Amino acid sequence: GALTESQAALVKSSWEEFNANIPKHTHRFFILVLEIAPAAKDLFSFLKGTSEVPQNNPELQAHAGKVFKLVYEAAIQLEVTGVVVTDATLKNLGSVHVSKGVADAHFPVVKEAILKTIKEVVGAKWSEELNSAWTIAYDELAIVIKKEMDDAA
């Protein structure tokens, strides 16, 4: 629905449920990233050097917390305004990803890990409409971040 108010409402409620247990869901998210692309471990300071994904690391928690909140806020923004607006936070973001060695081809990795995270968080409440809602917000945000990366470089 390239975000109907009911699509927006679902992203908000699944985000709230996400954010109710940051320790568990952010740990789950990084397991899912490494299962999809084990080589991505090396990109994160808080991981590189560990055996298993840490369970009580505040840097891991703060980073995965920010990533999910920005997709959520992009979903509201698309629904309200019809676009994802660039800003200071997203151009700064463009600059940190270039520094960290994040490339365009990494985006599908974090997309699949997010969809799989959200499916586990909501359990039986999962729907095709929820999945298509997170998908659209992620893709539209990703477009705008990829631009800034292009531009940061």
Ligand code: HEM
């Ligand atoms: C829509 C998708 C994405 C969002 C909203 C996002 C958001 C962010 C944010 C908000 C930060 C923190 C910036 C700061 O305060 O310095 C961050 C850092 C970072 N992100 Fe992204 N990200 C996305 C995609 C990805 C992807 C695909 C990767 C790579 C697999 C990635 C890897 C990183 C790394 C390595 C850092 C630095 C974290 C650190 O060690 O502090 N991100 N991202």
